[PDB]
Subunit: 88 residues, 21 copies
Amino acid sequence: QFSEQVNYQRALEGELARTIETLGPVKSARVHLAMPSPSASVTVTLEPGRALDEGQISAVVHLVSSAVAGLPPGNVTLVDQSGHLLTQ
Amino acid sequence: QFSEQVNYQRALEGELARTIETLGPVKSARVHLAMPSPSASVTVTLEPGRALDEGQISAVVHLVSSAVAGLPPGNVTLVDQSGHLLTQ
Amino acid sequence: QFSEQVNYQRALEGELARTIETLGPVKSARVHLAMPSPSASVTVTLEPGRALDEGQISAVVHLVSSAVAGLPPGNVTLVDQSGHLLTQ
Amino acid sequence: QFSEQVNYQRALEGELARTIETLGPVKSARVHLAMPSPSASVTVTLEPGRALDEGQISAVVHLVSSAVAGLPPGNVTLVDQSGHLLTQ
Amino acid sequence: QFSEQVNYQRALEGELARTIETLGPVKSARVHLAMPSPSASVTVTLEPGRALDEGQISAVVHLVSSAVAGLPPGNVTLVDQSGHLLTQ
Amino acid sequence: QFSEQVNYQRALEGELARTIETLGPVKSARVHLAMPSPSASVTVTLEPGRALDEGQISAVVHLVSSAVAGLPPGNVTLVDQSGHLLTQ
Amino acid sequence: QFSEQVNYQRALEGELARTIETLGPVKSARVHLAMPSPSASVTVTLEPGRALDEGQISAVVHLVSSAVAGLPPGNVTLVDQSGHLLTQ
Amino acid sequence: QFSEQVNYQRALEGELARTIETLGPVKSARVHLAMPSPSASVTVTLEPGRALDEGQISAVVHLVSSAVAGLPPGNVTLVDQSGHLLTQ
Amino acid sequence: QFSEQVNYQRALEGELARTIETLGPVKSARVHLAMPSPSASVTVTLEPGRALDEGQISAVVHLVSSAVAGLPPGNVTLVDQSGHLLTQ
Amino acid sequence: QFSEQVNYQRALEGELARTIETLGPVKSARVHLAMPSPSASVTVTLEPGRALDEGQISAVVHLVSSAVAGLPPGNVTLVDQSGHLLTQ
Amino acid sequence: QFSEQVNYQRALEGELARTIETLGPVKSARVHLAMPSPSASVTVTLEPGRALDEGQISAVVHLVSSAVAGLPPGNVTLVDQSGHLLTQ
Amino acid sequence: QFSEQVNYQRALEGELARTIETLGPVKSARVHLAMPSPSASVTVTLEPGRALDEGQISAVVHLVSSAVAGLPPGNVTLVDQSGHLLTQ
Amino acid sequence: QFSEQVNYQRALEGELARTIETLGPVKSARVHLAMPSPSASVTVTLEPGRALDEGQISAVVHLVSSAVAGLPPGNVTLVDQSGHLLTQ
Amino acid sequence: QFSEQVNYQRALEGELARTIETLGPVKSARVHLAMPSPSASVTVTLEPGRALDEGQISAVVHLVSSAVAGLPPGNVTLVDQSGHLLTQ
Amino acid sequence: QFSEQVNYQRALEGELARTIETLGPVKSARVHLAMPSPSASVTVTLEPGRALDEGQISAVVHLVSSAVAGLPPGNVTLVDQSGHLLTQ
Amino acid sequence: QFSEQVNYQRALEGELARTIETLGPVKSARVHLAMPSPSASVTVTLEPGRALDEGQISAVVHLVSSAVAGLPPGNVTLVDQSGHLLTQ
Amino acid sequence: QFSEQVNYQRALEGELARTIETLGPVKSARVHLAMPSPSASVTVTLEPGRALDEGQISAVVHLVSSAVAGLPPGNVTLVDQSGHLLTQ
Amino acid sequence: QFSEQVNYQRALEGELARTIETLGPVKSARVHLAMPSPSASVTVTLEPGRALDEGQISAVVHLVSSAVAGLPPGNVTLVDQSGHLLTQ
Amino acid sequence: QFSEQVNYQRALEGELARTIETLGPVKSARVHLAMPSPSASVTVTLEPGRALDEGQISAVVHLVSSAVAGLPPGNVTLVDQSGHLLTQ
Amino acid sequence: QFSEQVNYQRALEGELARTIETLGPVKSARVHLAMPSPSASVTVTLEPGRALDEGQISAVVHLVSSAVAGLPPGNVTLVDQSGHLLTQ
Amino acid sequence: QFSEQVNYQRALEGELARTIETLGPVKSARVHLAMPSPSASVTVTLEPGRALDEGQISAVVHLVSSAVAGLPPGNVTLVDQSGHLLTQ
């Protein structure tokens, strides 16, 4: 009951990442989920010479807050490849 | 009871995506469902040089809110390939 | 008890779609059902150069609301291949 | 107890359809039943250049409302091959 | 207990039909029974150039209402091959 | 306990019919029984150019009402090969 | 417990018939019993050019009412090969 | 417990008959017993040109009423080969 | 417990008969017992040209009433080969 | 427990008879016992031209009343080969 | 527990008899016991031309009343080969 | 528990007899015991031309009353080969 | 538990006898024990031309009363080979 | 539990005897024990021409009363080979 | 239930480390989690000649506080390769 | 539990005897123990021409009273080879 | 449940040590954990000619206090290769 | 549980004896223990021409009273090879 | 549950010793733990010509008090190779 | 549970003895323990021409009182090879 | 649970001894533990021509009191190879 609850999450994370990857100014993403009070942390490498606008942050935040059961958009952490914690 | 509840969802998501794909200005979609309080997140790549009108958003939102049991149209997140969180 | 409840639905959806297909100005349909409070979402591609009249919407809506147990005609979503959410 | 309750219905529907087919101005019918509060939806293709009169609707409606246990004639939906929801 | 309750009915229907067939102005009949509050629906093709008189309707109605347990003659629906719902 | 309760009836019906057949102005009979409140329906083809008198109806009615347990002579339906519901 | 209760009756009926056959003006008889409130129905073909007198009816009626447990002589139905319900 | 209770009776009847046969003016007898409130019915063919006197009836009646447990001499029915119900 | 209770009786009857046979004016006897309230019925063929005196009846009656448990001499029926019920 | 209770009696009877046989004016005896309230019936053929005196009856009566458990000398029936019930 | 209780008695009787045989004026004896309230019956053939005196009766009576458990000397019946019930 | 209780007695009797045999004026003895209230019966053949004195009776009586458990010397019966019940 | 309780006694008796044999004026003894209230009976053949004195009786009586559990010296019976009950 | 309780005693007796044998004026002893209230009986053959003094009796009495559990010296019986009960 | 709870953590730690590694001024990281009140400790080797700014600390702290269930950002310890405890 | 409780005693007795044997004026001893209230009896053959002094008796008495559990020195019986009960 | 709880700790200790090793002025570390109220003891060999500053102690203390569940930074003991207990 | 409790004692006794043997003026000892209230009895053969002093008795008494659990020095009996009970 | 609790301790002791060995003025250590209220005892051989300072004692004491669960630094005993109990 | 409790003691005794042997003026010792209230008895052979001083007694007494659980130094008995109970 | 509790102690004792051996003026030690209220006894052979000072006693006493669970330093007994109980 456990070794495929965490093997499901291992692919949901790898699926959520492959969609954020196909999002324009995101060369590669890397999601981790914390499903017990849930939360997630997305690390994105933007395309060389780009920067996510303030609305493009809610794109990725909601793109993840909705794909996971019970995770509000406030518990999602977005981080570039240059530090830069984007989501408050 | 679990490994085919989430294997059902894996095809419902891939079925819901193949119908939104056949919707005109949608070159490819990518759905994720959060079924415990449900919600979904659709990421669509529009046809090159197109943009979903304000009524075409309710098309895709209801096209998904109805294909899933108990998911209201407010919990559906639509996102382009250019950020642009379309559904409030 | 599960893997053929959802395998029944997989054919009911594919049966309901093949009848709407044989409906005149409907080149191909694509039904999804949400059976727990039920609802359905039909996506139809009309014949090239056609448009469903206001009574032809109640045709397809009732053609689906009756073929599924407990689904009222208000919970059925009809959508063209051009956005156009037809059922309110 | 399930896989032949719905395999019974799969033939009752295909039997009810083959009798409506042998009804004069009906080139082919296509019945779906919703047996939990029951209801049915008949889609008929009329013979080329025909139209069901107002009494011929009660023919097909009662021809189906009686062949199914507990289904009143008000819950039967009849639809042509040209939209045209015939039963109110 | 089920797959021969409905396999009994499948022959009772086919037996009741072969007797109505041997009834004079009835070239072929086709009975369906609804046994849970029972009811039946007979569709008869009359001999070419004939029509069932008002007493010949009670013949076929009672010929069926009595061959089935608990089915009153009011719940029997008789229909020609030309629409024409004969039994009220 | 079922598949030979209805296989008994299948021969009782075929036995009751072969005795009515040997009854003079009856070229062939065809009985169906409804044994749960019982009832029966006899369809007789009279000899060419004959007609059952009013007492010959009580012959066949009692010939059947007595051969079946609990079936009164009022619940027996007799019908010719020409419509003609004989028993009220 | 059933398939030889009704296989006993199948021979008792065929035994009761072979004794009535050896009764003078009875060329062949044919008995059916209704054993749950019992009753029986005898159909006799009289010798060519004979007729059972009013006392010869009580012969056959008691010849059957006594050979079956609990069957009064009032529940026995005697019928010729010419209609003619003999026992009231 | 049943198939030799009625196989006992089948020989008791055939034994009781072979003794009445050896009784003078009785060329052959034929007994049937009704053992649940018991009763019996004897059919005797008298020797050609004979007739049982009024005391010879109590012979055969008691010859049977005593050979069966609990059967009074009033429940025994004696019948010739010419109708003629002898025992009241 | 049954098939040799009645197989015991089958020899007791055949033993009781072989002793009455060796009784002088009795060429052959034939006993039947009714053992549930018991009773018996003896049929004797007297030697050609003999007749049992009034005391010779109590011989055979007691010869049987005592050889069977609980059978009084009043429940024993003696009958000649010429009718003639001897025991009241 | 039964088939040798009555197989014991079958030899006790045949033993009691072989002793009465060796009793002088008794050429052969034949005993039957009724053991549930017991009783017995002895049939004796006296030597040709002899007759049991009144005391020789109590010989045979007590010779049997004592060899059987619980059988009083009043329930023993003695009978010659010429009728003649000897014991009252 | 039974077939050697009565096989014990079968030898006790044959042992008691072989001792009375060795008693002088007793050429052969023959004992039967009635062991449930016990009793016995001795039949003795005296030596040719002898007779048991009144004290020789108590010899044989006590010779048997004591060899059997619970049998008083009053329940022992002694009988010669010439009738002659010796013990009162 | 029985077939060697009475096989013990069969040797105790044969042992008690072989000691009385070695007693002087006793050519052979023959003991029977009645062990349920016990008693015994000794039959002795005295040496030719001898007779047991009044004290020699208490010898044999006590020689037996003591060799058996619970048997008083009053319940022991001694008998010669010439009748002569010696013990009162 | 029985067949060696009485096989023990069979040797104790034969042991007690072989010691009394070695006692001077006792050529051979023969003991029987009655062990349920116990008692014993010794029969001794004295040496030819001897007689046990009054004290030699208490020798043999106590020689036996003590070798058996619970047997008082009053319940021991001593008897010569010439009658002569020695112990009161 | 029994066949070696009495096989123990069989050697204790034979051991107790072999020690009394080695006691001077005792050529051979022979002990029997009565172990349920115990007691013993010693029979000693003294050396030819000897006699046990009054103290030599307490030797043998205590030599046995102590070698057996619970046996007082009053319940030990000592007897010579010449009668002579030594212990009171 | 244990050896893969801590084998899950062994990869989550190695996954969390490979994402912090792809973060710009982080040449290699090394995470340890303390999941019972959780906490984590990250040791990072910065790129040669770099230093994490004060906002780049909240990047790595939230990048870890969110990827683990229930771990607040206060319980995360960040340390360089030169001592330098960065998180208070 | 028994056959080595008394096989232990058989060696304890033979061990206790071999130590008293090695005691000076004791050529051979012979002990028997009575272990249920215990007691013992020692028989000693003194060296030819010796006699145990009054203190040498307490030697052997205590040498045995102590080697056995619960046996006081008063219950030990010492006896020479010449009678002579030494211990009171 | 034990042999891999302490085999987990054996690697956590060896993992925690390999990270402190990669910390600059730490040539090799050696951790031991005390997990029941937990505590740990780190022994570090500094690089030749170095010394941990006062902030570099909180580095290693928190680097360990956080990698272990429930271990406060006060229960962590740090020691050089030259004595020098660094953590109070 | 028994056969090595007394096999332990068999060696403890043989061990205790081999130590007293190595005690100077003791050429050989021989111990017996009474372990249920314990006690022991030591028999010692002193070296030729020696005698145990009054303190050498407490040596051997305590050498044994202490080597056995619960045995006081008062329950130990010491005896020479010349009688001489040494311990009071 | 035991043989590896003490086999764990056997390596923890050998691990704790190998770290104290790598501590500078400690050529070899040797730890023993007392884990039930725990305590430990360290014996250290210092490098030839060295001595642990007063702070170097708290090094080794805390290096051990922390590596073991629940062991305070007061229950740790440190001892040189020259006596010298260092920890109070 | 027993045969190695006393096999443990057999080596503890042999171990305790081999240490006292290595004690200077003790050429060989021999310990016995009494472990149920424990006690021990040591027998020591001193080196030829030595004697244990008053403090050397407490050496051996405590050397044994401490090596055994619960044994006070007062219950230890020390004895030389010359009698001489050393411990009071 | 026992044979390795005392096999653990057998090595703990042999381990504790090998550390005291490496203690300077201790050529060899020999420890015994008493673990039920524990205690131990150490016997040490000092190096030839040495003597443990008063502080070197607390070294060895605490070196043992701490290596064993629950053993205070007062219950440890230290003894040289020359008597000399060192620990009070």
